[PDB]
Ligand SMILES: [Cl-]
């Protein structure tokens with residue numbers, strides 16, 4: 440029976456390794472995509488500098504910077520919240536009650552921070568509609584479509600990248616732990 | 621046999637530090653009486669404002685007081701670490717930390733400015749609502765708290781250091 | 792290293808205080824904007840009504 | 853070893869401080885602009901009331 444088990448281990452290892460390979464390829468392709476979207480962004484910025492007065496442009500650049508920062512914030516924050524959540528879940532029964540209470544407190548503070556970040560998302564969207572309405576008058580419709588596509592693509596693409604990175608990291612971890620056997 | 625000379629020099633030094641440390645502890649106790657009395661007085665002022673003042677203006681008052689502790693303690697922790705890194709001169713990674721630290725210090729200065737603004741506003745709104753005596757109690761209370769946390773932290777740092785050297789030398 | 796730990800803890804305290812103070816300030820700012828907006832609205836209502844009382848006089852003469 | 857998590861917390865509160873600061877800026881600029889516009893309008897209508905007053 441030992442043969443069956445060993446070959447089973449080998450099968451699993453090979454499969455997981457394949458998944459890791461395909462995910463890496465996806466990392467490369469997606470990186471090409473981020474490069475392209477970045478170039479489109481630079482183009483939009485160039486076009487807007489000409490038509491937009493200095494205040495409008497400062498609100499624009501400030502807006503995008505705050506976008507990147509906001510997204511990364513929500514992803515890191517949601518990350519720690521998920522980790523603490525799974526820790527509390529799989530935590531052994533009994534052990535220490537003060538530990539369960541401290542972890543619950545971490546859950547509380549993280550969820551509150553999440554609400555604050557939510558309000559921040561609302562305000563940032565307000566800013567987005569503000570810049571959208573102001574810039575709609577200044578620029579053409581085609582370049583405008585390219586702009587909107589770009590802005591949405593930046594955030595969505597950043598998230599896609601980070602989630603993928605998490606998956607590949609995890610797969611690599613389970614693979615390593617399994618090979619150690 | 622100058623080893624004797626050195627040993628007695630130590631013994632004298634440690635004795636001195638023990639004395640000064642005692643003085644600092646007693647002074648800390650008196651300061652503790654002061655913080656308690658001032659805190660109860662604070663509760664009283666809060667009650668009077670609760671009765672006489674409006675809910676909104678009262679809310680800005682609570683905002684002000686809550687923000688006060690945070691501002692003061694912030695400047696004390698910030699000035700503390702800044703002194704730690706500046707004294708740390710007595711592979712150049714630190715220079716960047718110094719930069720961010722001074723920038724944070726300027727930002728905190730701006731925050732102090734706004735807090736002082738709010739202090740003037742709460743003072744103006746409260747002068748009309750309250751008596752001159754109760755007003756004296758309010759001003760005395762706010763300034764007493766602000767200065768008092770600083771004094772407390774300074775003393776606590778001093779004593780903590782004295783204990784550090786006493787223990788370190790005493791083996 | 793423990794000095795790194797403690798130093799980072801102090802940093803966290805700092806940025807916490809920063810965030811909190813900026814939050815309270817933003818709130819007081821929004822409340823202040825609504826208050827001044829409202830009071831000013833009142834003022835323009837008064838002024839326009841006084842200009843109306845002044846306007847009705849010219850009609851007769 | 854788990855201090856890197858604490859570093860993550862610090863990064864989070866950094867983002868907080870930055871975003872709230874930027875928001876405060878846009879708010880201050882917003883109050884100065886809006887106040888300026890109000891001053892303009894009230895000045896205008898006051899001037900109309902003055903031209904009417906000379907009658
Ligand atoms: Cl928060």
Ligand SMILES: [Cl-]
Nearest residue numbers: 724727809869
């Ligand atoms: Cl800062």
